[PDB]
Amino acid sequence: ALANFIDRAATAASQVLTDFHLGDFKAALEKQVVAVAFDDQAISCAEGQATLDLAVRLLARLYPVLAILPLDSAASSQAQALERLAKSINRKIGIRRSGKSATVCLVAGATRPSLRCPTFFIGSDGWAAKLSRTDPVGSGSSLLPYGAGAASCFGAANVFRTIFAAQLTGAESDENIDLSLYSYNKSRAGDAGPIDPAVDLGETHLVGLGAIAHGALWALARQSGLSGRLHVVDHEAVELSNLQRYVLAGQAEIGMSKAVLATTALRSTALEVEAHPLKWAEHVARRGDWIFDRVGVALDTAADRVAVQGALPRWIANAWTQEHDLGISRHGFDDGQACLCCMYMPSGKSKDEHQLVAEELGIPEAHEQVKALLQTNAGVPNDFVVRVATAMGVPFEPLAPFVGQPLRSFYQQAICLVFQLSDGSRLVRTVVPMAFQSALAGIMLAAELVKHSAGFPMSPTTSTRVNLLRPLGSHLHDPKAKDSSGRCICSDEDFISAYRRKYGN
Amino acid sequence: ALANFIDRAATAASQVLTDFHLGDFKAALEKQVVAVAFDDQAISCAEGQATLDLAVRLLARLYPVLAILPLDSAASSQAQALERLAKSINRKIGIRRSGKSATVCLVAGATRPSLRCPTFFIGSDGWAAKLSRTDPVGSGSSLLPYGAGAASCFGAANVFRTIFAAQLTGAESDENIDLSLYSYNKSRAGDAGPIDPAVDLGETHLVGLGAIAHGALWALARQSGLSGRLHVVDHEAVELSNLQRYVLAGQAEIGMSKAVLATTALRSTALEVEAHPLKWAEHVARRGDWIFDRVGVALDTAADRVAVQGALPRWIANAWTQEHDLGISRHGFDDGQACLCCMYMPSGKSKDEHQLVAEELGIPEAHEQVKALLQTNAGVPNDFVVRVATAMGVPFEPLAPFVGQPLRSFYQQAICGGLVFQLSDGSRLVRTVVPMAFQSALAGIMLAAELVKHSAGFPMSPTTSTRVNLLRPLGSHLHDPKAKDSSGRCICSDEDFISAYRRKY
Amino acid sequence: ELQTVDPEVSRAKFDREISRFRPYADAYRMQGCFLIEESFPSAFFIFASPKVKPRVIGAAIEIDFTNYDLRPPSVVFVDPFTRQPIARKDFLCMAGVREYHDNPAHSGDPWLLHRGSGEGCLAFILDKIIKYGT
Amino acid sequence: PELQTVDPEVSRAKFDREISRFRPYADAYRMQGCFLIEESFPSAFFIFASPKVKPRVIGAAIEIDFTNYDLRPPSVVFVDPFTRQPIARKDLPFIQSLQDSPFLCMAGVREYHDNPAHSGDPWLLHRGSGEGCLAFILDKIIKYGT
Amino acid sequence: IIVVVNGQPTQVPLHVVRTKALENTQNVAQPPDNWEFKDEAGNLTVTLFLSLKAGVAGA
Ligand SMILES: [Zn+2]
Ligand SMILES: [Zn+2]
């Protein structure tokens, strides 16, 4: 019952777990039974259903055995649907209808499952996400998804930190969470956030339609009263390994245009969705109008996000999943605050690609031969691939077919593979976040676009960060000064004029 | 008593007389006593004084002996001044105080001198120039000098055509002239034309200050009450030879700037005189303002006159002397009439300088060698200056100083300055046209008449140009029509030139 | 590369780079550098050693200012008559040039460390070509 | 020298118009080796290079002067590409001593019409025909060098 | 036909009129090419004008 995409989930784990070993890891998963329990309070409201929906979507992307536990006869209808959701993500997933074997349980609603395994009550009330290790928290009656969905991400994170407690440090599970996704402070009885289906996105652009965007699209599609025109922009297609992180991708979405998927995700909103199977540059070029009223960035590299700022939209919400945190940043250009280019201004020189690849090949001092084999695109000799294989700690045989091929070929296959030949000791360089990190970052992104287009008072700091591999922070807000180098385009009078020319002030 | 500049006067006569020989011609002059006779009527008024002034100015530039004949005692003072004028032009000139030896005679005033020689009564009444062969015609009371001065010119021409009659064809003496310089028709008892001398010339440009300009200056200085700003433009200095033609130059003006001369000659008018001792092009470039309200042109070459029109003055008067004809043409540019460039549009290909130069020097077959020497402007080898003297029939020795100098120098000093002309007893004729003083003076009078009439606002001439042949009896019809160039190649057809004109005016 | 910066920005920056070259055109001509064509986003130059007799076009380039100056300019050697890219048998490894920063071997020297310094502007590029090539 | 005596409004409109008439063709002129380097009334400065010769050699550089255009035809002076100083025919890689500056022996050109040996072919016989416009001069030079 | 030859009139193909006009006014000294036959408007019983070209000498 491990997923066909499990190696990608193992690539992710290997980046957060100490003393990772692929074989142990997969065995550790097979000994688990992760329980989702729920009662009539949860299945009867929109918040509880949302929380269940996302929780199953997260857990089915990692755990080979789930127990789906309706706690009364009312919850039996939702149960069948949850089993069907879990199987749509991993057709061979294991489904238990009993908790006798649970290693960890998540509970929505008001009823206690009465199990001997660690148990987390999750839930919500409007903007507030709730988790408790000792008592049910229940699910509210609003039509808001943000608190309910964020609670699932906190649910799944605490599941992961509990199963893998022995391979993490400073990683205690949470005892209580009462976090407002409206304010990102502890939820106050008076200090609640407005709840209204009266929200128009105007003309909004969502750039990047991958994992983080999937969390955002999950939320927007549960946002009642959403009106407006939304552009979704991505040129890529869903790959099998994306089902490790992309909460709206199941087996049936493999191979499909990410732009076509984002469209159908929103079919039940009142949004007029325009889907563009293009990169941002081609979108910008085909519009010929550089009026961007509102842009949500859900991309994977600095340069791509910096390019979005170059176009000078009125306002950007930027979303990221990095190694030690996920988060959201907010940028007007002409407001005194940091700009998206600020967020990635380089501070110094770094290692060149021929050098970083030389470390990943266990040949740190062959940087000159890696640069030459990359420029000359010549075949890797036999004595090179024996050196690399020995430096990599694997047998030479899996890497023998590469003898005579470009080094770019060797690195694009064995390295992008050797992780499995080394039982997880050789880590890949590219960060693969966990599904629950991507989903929460996307929920925050949907949160920001909706709040900003509903005109709420905007955030006091540029960015908000969460680290789901530790107990939730008590101060999620992160300030960020405008770059003071002079070298950031938000310092440039030509850029400032072109922004005012479009938006005034 | 022949003048020190007599060879230049002989040059001029050599171009109008048949069977010319230089010894013969000077001998002919030496057998003459040309008498100017005058009474109280002539000397008591400005028209009388002006006629006498110019008659003497013209006759002293050619004839070696004059008789100055006051006919009553009031005319005595004028007689002494007239003698001093003659001598200031030719200090070796002869003055007779007796009429018995006159061979021809000009008379101003009302009294007959009753001499045994051809006698021509000259005078004027305002715009009218008057000459009779039989009765005194008198001097009017106006303060205009145009009729009075034109009368002298006709007087001097008839003196010349009487003395040299046998070397002229169709050159009878005039019996009667009564010509209005206002209309250039026979004067009428009604239309006397306006004689008020108080007029303002506006801001006028006189371009070229040679012979023609001396006639104009002579007139502008003798119109009492005339106001105006006169710009006078010429870069050259008076040379000895010029006294053959320049009615306001005497021995004392040899070497004087022509612009300074013209300034001094106007010092007693109320004209605001600005002297520009520069070429037109340098004047135009320093001025940096292409508004020229009124330009009088008194130049020597087609190119120089056309260059003036290129500046696009509002109105031009152009004056010339040629072999058998002098005159004035008038040009607005945007008036449906011929512009000054129309006057000199070329009618077809011609011979090049190398050929015409080669022909003059009696070597029409060294064209190729003369072409090289006019381009290199190299020194004429000894063997070349030898050939030329032989083919021309003169000694080598006077020309030896030109050996080694530029050919242009050799040519324009030896040939155009008349050195080979003297050496050949006038048989080797100069190709440079040299007009008679009485033609130069009349052309300039007519030019100052046009500028004055134009600036008083009189309706302008029915035809483009007005012509006079002083080597024949005055014509019955002096008006000369000229049609606009219709080739398409004159600038008065150019829409850019037309636009530049309308912008200014 | 496609223009994605607001073109009112890049056009303004390119036009100023050109305005600033014009007062120096005579000086550059002396060194053999001739602006041939100029029209956003490209500026076409031709080069000739002033001391090489006979006078020989040693190089022509196209300089691209697409997305200037967030992205630094591309410098391409082209044939002076056809404007087509040429092979070495007839890129400048230098910061301020987009071919250099986009070379993975120089991923450690990012352009935003240099932006605004004087590297990557037109005079900087013209002066480097003049000094080395001659 | 020749000083601007024609109303400069006239000669500057005509110049400006010759440059305007050149601009749409500049690519095709480049294909023949013809490069407009600098234009500033009264002067138009070009470089020329054989597209058909390898290595590419600057074979000619002209200053074209349009003072008093088009009452006076324009002056064509061969100059050095970098100094912009006249050159002698010895240093020049219808053209007429080797130490003397070459000129274009042709109706439409000031060094022709002012040459004494062609005084008999005055410019005003040719004005308004095409001879002496910028394209007429450019055509001749492009065709001398190949 | 009235031909004004150098201001002097005389009563008379077209070179036939100029030839008799030049013979009547004794102005046959100058080649017939130097003369320009024009009409009352100046175009290169009626009155025609057999005059010369404008002049260059003046200084
Ligand atoms: Zn910034
Ligand atoms: Zn005309």
Side-chain angles (χ1 to χ4, degrees), chain A residues 1-187 189-190 192-416 418-505, chain B residues 1-187 189-505, chain C residues 1-87 92-134, chain D residues 1-89 91-93 95-143 145-146, chain E:
Chain A
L2 286 163
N4 52 22
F5 52 80
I6 197 68
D7 281 336
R8 194 53 150 179
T11 299
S14 71
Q15 305 174 2
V16 311
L17 296 185
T18 68
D19 298 328
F20 180 87
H21 303 276
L22 189 52
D24 296 345
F25 178 70
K26 292 182 167 175
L29 292 174
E30 282 175 329
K31 283 171 194 188
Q32 304 303 310
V33 176
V34 177
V36 176
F38 50 97
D39 68 348
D40 187 26
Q41 203 273 332
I43 63 93
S44 286
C45 64
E47 281 186 18
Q49 288 163 340
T51 293
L52 290 183
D53 187 76
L54 191 56
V56 170
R57 286 184 191 272
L58 289 174
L59 297 165
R61 285 165 201 300
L62 177 51
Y63 302 99
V65 182
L66 304 184
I68 301 304
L69 309 176
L71 296 176
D72 43 48
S73 61
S76 294
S77 311
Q78 184 78 348
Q80 302 158 0
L82 297 180
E83 300 172 350
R84 274 179 268 106
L85 180 54
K87 276 161 176 216
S88 70
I89 306 171
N90 176 11
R91 320 180 86 212
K92 306 196 140 174
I93 198 181
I95 298 299
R96 311 276 186 262
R97 325 276 175 104
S98 160
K100 302 182 164 188
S101 53
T103 57
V104 70
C105 185
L106 288 184
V107 179
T111 299
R112 304 171 181 270
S114 298
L115 302 178
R116 301 181 184 184
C117 71
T119 299
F120 299 91
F121 302 94
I122 50 169
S124 56
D125 196 0
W127 283 105
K130 288 174 188 175
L131 179 143
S132 176
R133 188 140 158 201
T134 71
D135 308 286
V137 287
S139 270
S141 71
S142 82
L143 294 188
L144 286 188
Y146 309 97
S152 303
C153 303
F154 288 127
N158 274 272
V159 162
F160 180 87
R161 298 211 304 286
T162 288
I163 299 170
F164 291 104
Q167 297 185 257
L168 300 162
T169 309
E172 300 89 344
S173 71
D174 294 285
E175 305 306 326
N176 285 286
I177 298 162
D178 197 10
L179 172 68
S180 161
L181 263 83
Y182 179 77
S183 58
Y184 294 112
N185 291 323
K186 178 165 189 163
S187 185
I195 307 163
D196 194 11
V199 171
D200 179 327
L201 295 193
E203 187 175 48
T204 290
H205 298 259
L206 177 70
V207 186
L209 304 170
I212 294 183
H214 271 223
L217 296 160
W218 177 94
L220 289 178
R222 285 163 216 270
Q223 170 65 85
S224 184
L226 198 53
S227 49
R229 194 181 314 281
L230 178 57
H231 302 275
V232 293
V233 182
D234 196 322
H235 72 294
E236 291 179 356
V238 169
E239 281 174 7
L240 171 58
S241 75
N242 305 149
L243 316 203
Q244 171 273 330
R245 271 180 332 275
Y246 291 30
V247 292
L248 297 180
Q251 303 295 325
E253 289 59 61
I254 296 166
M256 100 180 301
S257 160
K258 288 179 192 192
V260 166
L261 161 39
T263 292
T264 294
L266 299 176
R267 77 209 176 261
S268 276
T269 78
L271 293 175
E272 289 181 25
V273 188
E274 292 179 43
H276 311 283
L278 313 175
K279 309 147 160 282
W280 167 253
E282 310 167 309
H283 181 53
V284 169
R286 295 191 182 179
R287 275 172 56 87
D289 168 31
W290 309 67
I291 299 300
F292 302 98
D293 177 26
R294 221 189 325 281
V295 177
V297 176
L299 296 167
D300 296 339
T301 64
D304 295 336
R305 311 176 218 264
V306 170
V308 174
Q309 187 72 102
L312 289 178
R314 188 165 63 86
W315 184 84
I316 300 176
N318 187 48
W320 70 86
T321 52
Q322 282 150 18
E323 182 172 0
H324 297 95
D325 79 272
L326 65 81
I328 205 93
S329 46
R330 315 139 178 98
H331 311 276
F333 191 73
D334 193 35
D335 54 28
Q337 298 321 306
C339 87
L340 184 53
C341 188
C342 291
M343 305 292 289
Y344 309 97
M345 277 303 284
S347 67
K349 301 194 179 173
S350 297
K351 293 181 176 173
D352 303 313
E353 279 297 305
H354 66 276
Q355 171 175 346
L356 291 166
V357 163
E359 298 155 27
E360 303 184 42
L361 297 174
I363 50 183
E365 314 316 323
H367 49 58
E368 185 198 353
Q369 173 169 13
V370 166
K371 190 206 292 181
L373 291 176
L374 290 177
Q375 293 172 357
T376 72
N377 213 24
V380 289
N382 190 15
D383 62 12
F384 168 85
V385 182
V386 172
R387 289 167 53 175
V388 169
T390 295
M392 299 275 72
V394 296
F396 161 70
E397 289 67 41
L399 310 178
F402 302 85
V403 171
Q405 301 173 19
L407 176 60
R408 322 189 160 264
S409 309
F410 185 91
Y411 182 98
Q412 200 183 358
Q413 306 169 27
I415 305 307
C416 294
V418 170
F419 168 76
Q420 296 169 187
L421 296 169
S422 63
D423 209 38
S425 42
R426 286 295 168 174
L427 299 191
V428 194
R429 197 180 62 204
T430 295
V431 169
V432 182
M434 307 271 342
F436 45 80
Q437 302 179 234
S438 303
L440 178 66
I443 286 161
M444 292 166 73
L445 181 63
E448 296 309 306
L449 298 172
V450 159
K451 288 192 283 176
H452 179 270
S453 73
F456 298 155
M458 265 311 292
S459 173
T461 53
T462 281
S463 48
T464 319
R465 305 185 181 240
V466 177
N467 175 2
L468 292 180
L469 292 148
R470 301 210 163 211
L472 184 60
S474 60
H475 191 90
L476 305 181
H477 317 287
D478 188 34
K480 178 65 172 197
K482 267 181 90 171
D483 194 282
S484 49
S485 57
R487 315 190 322 271
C488 193
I489 61 179
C490 73
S491 292
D492 180 291
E493 283 308 338
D494 295 304
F495 278 87
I496 297 172
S497 303
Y499 179 104
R500 289 169 173 165
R501 176 202 157 263
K502 291 147 76 175
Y503 317 120
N505 314 63
Chain B
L2 287 170
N4 53 6
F5 54 85
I6 195 66
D7 284 347
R8 195 67 179 182
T11 293
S14 72
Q15 311 186 341
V16 307
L17 303 174
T18 57
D19 314 301
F20 179 87
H21 309 276
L22 176 52
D24 284 332
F25 175 75
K26 288 165 174 177
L29 305 176
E30 283 189 313
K31 279 302 178 167
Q32 302 310 318
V33 178
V34 176
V36 182
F38 48 97
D39 70 348
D40 190 13
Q41 203 278 325
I43 61 91
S44 293
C45 68
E47 293 185 30
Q49 291 157 10
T51 297
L52 290 171
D53 182 77
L54 198 56
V56 173
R57 274 174 196 290
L58 293 173
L59 300 161
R61 295 174 194 284
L62 183 59
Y63 301 103
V65 179
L66 305 185
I68 304 292
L69 309 171
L71 302 174
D72 52 53
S73 66
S76 276
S77 326
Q78 192 64 353
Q80 295 145 321
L82 288 180
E83 297 174 12
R84 274 185 271 109
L85 177 59
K87 282 166 185 200
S88 67
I89 297 162
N90 179 0
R91 294 168 194 152
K92 322 181 270 213
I93 205 182
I95 307 291
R96 306 286 176 270
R97 316 239 176 95
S98 161
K100 298 185 173 181
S101 59
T103 62
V104 55
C105 180
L106 297 177
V107 180
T111 311
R112 304 180 192 264
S114 290
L115 303 182
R116 309 182 181 88
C117 58
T119 301
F120 295 99
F121 296 98
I122 57 170
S124 55
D125 197 10
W127 282 106
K130 294 172 178 184
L131 173 148
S132 174
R133 182 66 166 101
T134 64
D135 312 295
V137 293
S139 285
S141 57
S142 99
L143 307 179
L144 300 192
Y146 308 103
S152 317
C153 295
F154 295 119
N158 279 268
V159 172
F160 184 88
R161 306 206 298 277
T162 298
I163 299 162
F164 290 107
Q167 300 178 271
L168 298 162
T169 289
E172 300 86 3
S173 82
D174 290 291
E175 287 295 304
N176 275 306
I177 299 170
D178 197 6
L179 172 76
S180 158
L181 265 77
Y182 178 74
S183 71
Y184 290 113
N185 297 318
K186 191 170 175 186
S187 187
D191 278 11
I195 72 176
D196 190 1
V199 176
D200 191 273
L201 285 197
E203 203 181 55
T204 299
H205 286 70
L206 183 67
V207 185
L209 308 178
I212 290 189
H214 273 225
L217 302 159
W218 174 88
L220 301 182
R222 281 162 189 77
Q223 189 169 308
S224 209
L226 178 69
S227 63
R229 177 187 321 289
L230 193 58
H231 295 276
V232 295
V233 190
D234 202 297
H235 73 296
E236 296 188 334
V238 171
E239 283 161 23
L240 171 58
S241 278
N242 300 141
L243 284 49
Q244 171 271 331
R245 262 184 337 280
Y246 283 38
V247 294
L248 294 187
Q251 300 283 330
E253 284 70 42
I254 300 165
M256 190 174 194
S257 160
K258 296 185 200 186
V260 168
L261 199 157
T263 295
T264 297
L266 304 180
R267 180 183 183 164
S268 273
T269 69
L271 292 172
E272 302 142 48
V273 177
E274 295 203 26
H276 303 284
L278 315 186
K279 309 170 185 181
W280 172 249
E282 312 166 303
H283 178 45
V284 170
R286 292 196 189 167
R287 198 198 146 74
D289 149 43
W290 307 76
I291 302 288
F292 305 87
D293 208 72
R294 218 176 326 265
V295 181
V297 176
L299 290 171
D300 270 354
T301 62
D304 286 3
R305 308 162 185 280
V306 170
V308 172
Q309 178 77 93
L312 291 175
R314 191 166 60 84
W315 185 81
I316 292 161
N318 179 66
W320 67 90
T321 49
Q322 64 208 26
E323 193 171 44
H324 298 298
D325 157 83
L326 65 83
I328 188 85
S329 57
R330 318 142 174 109
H331 312 283
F333 184 88
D334 197 24
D335 57 7
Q337 307 302 322
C339 77
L340 186 46
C341 188
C342 292
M343 299 316 284
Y344 303 108
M345 286 292 288
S347 52
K349 290 193 183 190
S350 293
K351 290 184 174 171
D352 307 316
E353 267 303 304
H354 70 289
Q355 291 180 92
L356 299 165
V357 166
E359 294 168 15
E360 285 195 39
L361 311 176
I363 54 173
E365 288 319 288
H367 40 59
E368 189 190 7
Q369 164 169 24
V370 163
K371 190 202 292 179
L373 282 179
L374 282 180
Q375 292 156 345
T376 74
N377 216 29
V380 285
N382 210 291
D383 289 3
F384 172 85
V385 183
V386 168
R387 281 185 63 160
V388 166
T390 292
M392 297 278 81
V394 297
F396 166 74
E397 291 69 27
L399 313 168
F402 300 94
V403 181
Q405 297 183 23
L407 177 62
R408 303 189 151 293
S409 304
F410 171 28
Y411 174 88
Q412 208 184 317
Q413 280 153 27
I415 313 310
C416 285
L419 179 70
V420 171
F421 169 88
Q422 299 169 183
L423 303 161
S424 60
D425 193 48
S427 31
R428 294 297 175 167
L429 299 175
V430 188
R431 141 151 86 98
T432 293
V433 173
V434 179
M436 303 278 172
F438 44 76
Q439 300 171 253
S440 309
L442 178 61
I445 285 160
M446 296 164 73
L447 172 68
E450 293 324 287
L451 302 172
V452 165
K453 295 190 279 182
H454 190 264
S455 72
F458 298 150
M460 276 311 296
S461 164
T463 50
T464 296
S465 48
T466 308
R467 305 182 173 248
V468 170
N469 185 0
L470 296 177
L471 296 156
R472 292 206 171 207
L474 183 68
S476 63
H477 187 97
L478 308 184
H479 313 283
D480 204 38
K482 188 62 176 192
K484 265 178 97 153
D485 195 280
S486 63
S487 66
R489 306 188 309 265
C490 193
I491 52 165
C492 59
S493 260
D494 190 289
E495 286 306 317
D496 296 309
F497 279 91
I498 299 173
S499 285
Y501 185 95
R502 298 179 179 167
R503 174 182 55 79
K504 282 144 62 179
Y505 313 117
Chain C
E1 178 170 314
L2 299 176
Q3 178 78 33
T4 64
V5 173
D6 194 318
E8 291 241 347
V9 173
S10 301
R11 296 198 174 201
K13 292 196 168 282
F14 170 93
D15 291 346
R16 189 181 307 122
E17 286 298 317
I18 294 304
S19 303
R20 282 156 169 193
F21 171 84
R22 296 193 189 288
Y24 296 109
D26 291 335
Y28 275 114
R29 191 192 67 248
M30 295 294 300
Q31 298 168 291
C33 178
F34 306 88
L35 173 60
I36 295 296
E37 188 210 312
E38 168 277 301
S39 197
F40 175 83
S42 291
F44 175 52
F45 293 78
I46 65 169
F47 291 88
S49 270
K51 313 175 179 185
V52 163
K53 302 185 184 189
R55 307 317 191 183
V56 176
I57 305 189
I61 61 174
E62 189 168 334
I63 303 184
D64 171 80
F65 292 87
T66 301
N67 295 324
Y68 193 70
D69 69 336
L70 186 55
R71 296 273 290 158
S74 156
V75 177
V76 177
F77 290 95
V78 300
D79 182 73
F81 314 94
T82 76
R83 302 276 193 91
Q84 308 293 309
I86 72 174
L92 307 172
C93 195
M94 177 184 64
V97 180
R98 125 161 44 115
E99 278 78 13
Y100 162 99
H101 293 284
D102 292 358
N103 187 24
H106 303 108
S107 51
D109 197 28
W111 160 249
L112 286 181
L113 293 169
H114 305 291
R115 182 172 176 274
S117 75
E119 317 177 55
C121 74
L122 172 63
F124 176 89
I125 291 161
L126 290 187
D127 296 332
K128 296 299 180 186
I129 307 188
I130 293 169
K131 190 174 173 189
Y132 147 70
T134 311
Chain D
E2 183 113 1
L3 299 175
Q4 174 73 28
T5 63
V6 170
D7 192 335
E9 212 69 19
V10 171
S11 300
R12 188 177 316 259
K14 286 180 188 303
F15 176 82
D16 280 1
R17 183 175 316 125
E18 295 288 277
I19 300 298
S20 285
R21 285 167 169 191
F22 171 87
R23 298 280 182 207
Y25 289 109
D27 289 327
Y29 275 121
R30 187 186 70 251
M31 291 307 302
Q32 303 296 320
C34 180
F35 308 87
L36 178 63
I37 297 298
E38 194 208 317
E39 156 277 318
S40 203
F41 184 84
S43 301
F45 169 46
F46 296 79
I47 280 170
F48 293 83
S50 262
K52 290 173 176 187
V53 156
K54 184 168 110 168
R56 320 313 203 162
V57 172
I58 311 182
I62 64 176
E63 219 134 71
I64 300 190
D65 186 88
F66 291 85
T67 298
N68 296 328
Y69 189 71
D70 70 337
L71 182 45
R72 299 279 287 140
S75 168
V76 176
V77 176
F78 294 78
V79 307
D80 176 283
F82 329 90
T83 82
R84 290 240 256 159
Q85 291 293 317
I87 70 174
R89 186 69 190 72
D91 313 319
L92 186 51
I95 292 191
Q96 301 200 3
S97 348
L98 292 179
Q99 333 303 350
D100 308 338
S101 329
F103 75 94
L104 292 192
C105 209
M106 195 159 48
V109 171
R110 201 180 305 164
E111 289 75 14
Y112 175 80
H113 293 288
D114 297 342
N115 194 271
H118 310 299
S119 70
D121 193 12
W123 167 240
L124 290 176
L125 288 175
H126 301 270
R127 181 177 175 268
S129 73
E131 320 161 78
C133 72
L134 181 56
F136 168 86
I137 291 164
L138 290 186
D139 163 81
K140 306 299 156 177
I141 294 183
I142 290 179
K143 282 177 53 187
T146 196
Chain E
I1 304 184
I2 305 180
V3 183
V4 181
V5 186
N6 277 18
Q8 298 176 340
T10 183
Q11 195 176 351
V12 177
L14 192 55
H15 49 254
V16 180
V17 181
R18 173 185 65 182
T19 300
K20 189 165 189 174
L22 292 175
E23 291 166 5
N24 297 356
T25 65
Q26 315 183 24
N27 289 307
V28 300
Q30 195 161 166
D33 302 1
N34 313 8
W35 297 89
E36 292 184 340
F37 225 164
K38 301 172 303 185
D39 56 346
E40 303 172 6
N43 298 301
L44 286 186
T45 306
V46 64
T47 295
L48 305 176
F49 294 83
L50 188 60
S51 63
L52 303 171
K53 304 186 178 182
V56 293

